[PDB]
Design an enzyme around this catalytic site. Sequence first.
Site, PDB file in Angstrom:
ATOM      1  N   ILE A  13       0.680  -1.063   0.015  1.00 45.19           N
ATOM      2  CA  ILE A  13      -0.112   0.060  -0.054  1.00 45.19           C
ATOM      3  C   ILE A  13       0.817   1.352   0.075  1.00 45.19           C
ATOM      4  O   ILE A  13       0.182   2.460  -0.336  1.00 45.19           O
ATOM      5  CB  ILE A  13      -1.163  -0.028   1.302  1.00 45.19           C
ATOM      6  CG1 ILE A  13      -0.621  -0.067   2.599  1.00 45.19           C
ATOM      7  CG2 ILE A  13      -2.297  -0.966   0.761  1.00 45.19           C
ATOM      8  CD1 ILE A  13      -1.525   0.091   3.767  1.00 45.19           C
ATOM      9  N   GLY A  14       2.148   1.107   0.040  1.00 44.74           N
ATOM     10  CA  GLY A  14       2.940   2.333   0.135  1.00 44.74           C
ATOM     11  C   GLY A  14       4.359   2.129   0.393  1.00 44.74           C
ATOM     12  O   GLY A  14       4.891   0.996   0.779  1.00 44.74           O
ATOM     13  N   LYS A  15       5.203   3.086  -0.198  1.00 43.11           N
ATOM     14  CA  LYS A  15       6.705   3.012   0.127  1.00 43.11           C
ATOM     15  C   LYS A  15       7.004   4.209   1.183  1.00 43.11           C
ATOM     16  O   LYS A  15       6.841   5.294   0.838  1.00 43.11           O
ATOM     17  CB  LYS A  15       7.401   3.342  -1.272  1.00 43.11           C
ATOM     18  CG  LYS A  15       8.970   3.182  -0.981  1.00 43.11           C
ATOM     19  N   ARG A  17      10.083   6.272   3.696  1.00 48.02           N
ATOM     20  CA  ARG A  17      11.508   6.616   3.415  1.00 48.02           C
ATOM     21  C   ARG A  17      12.397   5.543   3.234  1.00 48.02           C
ATOM     22  O   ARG A  17      13.254   5.469   2.508  1.00 48.02           O
ATOM     23  CB  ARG A  17      11.930   7.579   4.861  1.00 48.02           C
ATOM     24  CG  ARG A  17      11.866   8.946   4.536  1.00 48.02           C
ATOM     25  CD  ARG A  17      12.750   9.738   6.052  1.00 48.02           C
ATOM     26  NE  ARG A  17      12.329   8.901   7.130  1.00 48.02           N
ATOM     27  CZ  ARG A  17      11.043   8.920   7.630  1.00 48.02           C
ATOM     28  NH1 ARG A  17       9.804   9.956   7.422  1.00 48.02           N
ATOM     29  NH2 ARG A  17      10.721   8.283   8.683  1.00 48.02           N
ATOM     30  N   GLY A  19      11.749   1.119   4.095  1.00 47.50           N
ATOM     31  CA  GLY A  19      10.540   0.331   4.593  1.00 47.50           C
ATOM     32  C   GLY A  19       9.306   0.344   3.856  1.00 47.50           C
ATOM     33  O   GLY A  19       8.726   1.457   3.482  1.00 47.50           O
ATOM     34  N   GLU A  20       8.651  -0.658   3.353  1.00 47.39           N
ATOM     35  CA  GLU A  20       7.498  -0.775   2.545  1.00 47.39           C
ATOM     36  C   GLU A  20       6.117  -0.978   3.592  1.00 47.39           C
ATOM     37  O   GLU A  20       6.276  -1.778   4.568  1.00 47.39           O
ATOM     38  CB  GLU A  20       7.534  -1.697   1.582  1.00 47.39           C
ATOM     39  CG  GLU A  20       7.596  -1.478   0.135  1.00 47.39           C
ATOM     40  CD  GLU A  20       6.446  -1.218  -0.655  1.00 47.39           C
ATOM     41  OE1 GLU A  20       6.237  -0.326  -1.575  1.00 47.39           O
ATOM     42  OE2 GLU A  20       5.425  -1.769  -0.409  1.00 47.39           O
ATOM     43  N   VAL A  21       5.328  -0.341   3.180  1.00 45.52           N
ATOM     44  CA  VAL A  21       3.849  -0.503   4.038  1.00 45.52           C
ATOM     45  C   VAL A  21       2.820  -1.461   3.245  1.00 45.52           C
ATOM     46  O   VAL A  21       2.667  -1.490   2.198  1.00 45.52           O
ATOM     47  CB  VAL A  21       3.007   0.706   4.150  1.00 45.52           C
ATOM     48  CG1 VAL A  21       2.055   0.443   5.270  1.00 45.52           C
ATOM     49  CG2 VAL A  21       4.101   1.735   4.957  1.00 45.52           C
ATOM     50  N   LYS A  34       4.589  -2.115   8.293  1.00 42.85           N
ATOM     51  CA  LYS A  34       5.634  -1.352   7.747  1.00 42.85           C
ATOM     52  C   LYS A  34       6.849  -2.501   7.730  1.00 42.85           C
ATOM     53  O   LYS A  34       7.319  -2.833   9.082  1.00 42.85           O
ATOM     54  CB  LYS A  34       5.928  -0.112   8.327  1.00 42.85           C
ATOM     55  CG  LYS A  34       6.825   0.733   7.799  1.00 42.85           C
ATOM     56  CD  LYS A  34       7.092   2.191   8.406  1.00 42.85           C
ATOM     57  CE  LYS A  34       7.991   3.263   7.523  1.00 42.85           C
ATOM     58  NZ  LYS A  34       8.012   4.550   8.023  1.00 42.85           N
ATOM     59  N   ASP A 135       8.251  16.093   9.721  1.00 46.94           N
ATOM     60  CA  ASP A 135       7.871  15.646   8.458  1.00 46.94           C
ATOM     61  C   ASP A 135       6.541  15.727   8.285  1.00 46.94           C
ATOM     62  O   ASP A 135       5.850  14.869   7.613  1.00 46.94           O
ATOM     63  CB  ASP A 135       8.232  14.341   7.858  1.00 46.94           C
ATOM     64  CG  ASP A 135       8.722  14.219   6.272  1.00 46.94           C
ATOM     65  OD1 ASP A 135       8.468  15.145   5.688  1.00 46.94           O
ATOM     66  OD2 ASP A 135       8.891  13.049   5.886  1.00 46.94           O
TER      67      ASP A 135
END
Length: 303
Positions: A13-15, A17, A19-21, A34, A135
């Site tokens: 579902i996401g990348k 900084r 680590g991938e989600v 994550k 951030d």
Amino acid sequence: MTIARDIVLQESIGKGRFGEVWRGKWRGEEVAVKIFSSREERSWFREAEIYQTVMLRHENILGFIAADNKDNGTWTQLWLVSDYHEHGSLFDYLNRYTVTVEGMIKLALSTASGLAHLHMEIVGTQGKPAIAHRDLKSKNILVKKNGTCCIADLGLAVRHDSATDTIDIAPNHRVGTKRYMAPEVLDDSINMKHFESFKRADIYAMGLVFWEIARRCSIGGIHEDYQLPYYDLVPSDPSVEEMRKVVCEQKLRPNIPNRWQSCEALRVMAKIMRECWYANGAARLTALRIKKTLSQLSQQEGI
């Protein structure tokens, strides 16, 4: 308790900084996972450390579940498990939909409530240190099913001890997203020995996020299309120098449209934005003051 062994990954579902989600299933419930490699241990540990801060939980902060390891027989994955929010980021939400006045206020208030909780030191035995995000951006805020926000990606956060006046890490310069960097971050004049500097830089970023939400507020079917702040001034993927020339030198800020002066809620949002955008961090509103202003506004609107 929730452990990595009992979770089955379903969809990327996401990348982050590093680590991938992934969306995964745990005991008949969707969770977000994550995943970091062994060489990203310092990043995984720092994020686990922030998420495990005493008294951190709040309805507008991503709900942490567990830090764990998973050995597949060849290599070890480092996991951070959290609540899953189907809508994804505020960036995704704002690109897909327009919001009502009620909708906009709920998004802005929930964002400011989450930020005020991170920023606030809670005294006592189960005390909470003050925390600055570093951030904040619409891509790092997730939208819940009830139409409220929760701040995610706490990996770059800094924590403060007021009694000894110390920060828990030695911070690097210009760590976040260039587009959302405060003027003092862009020109590196920020005093990183004073914790209040980090909270003030978060405020500037929140004002930019407020501008993104307000653009999508539809009154009588009239709204603006979705845009990132400075879409009209810098290229996609801007550099620090490109941002610095615009924000510090030319002293420009995202444009406040004429149609926002006709609506009371839009007038209050535009005023908050300007008061987040002063070049001097000390002149900016605090997250607590913003939460108070938006709470009074939500009360008068009967949201």
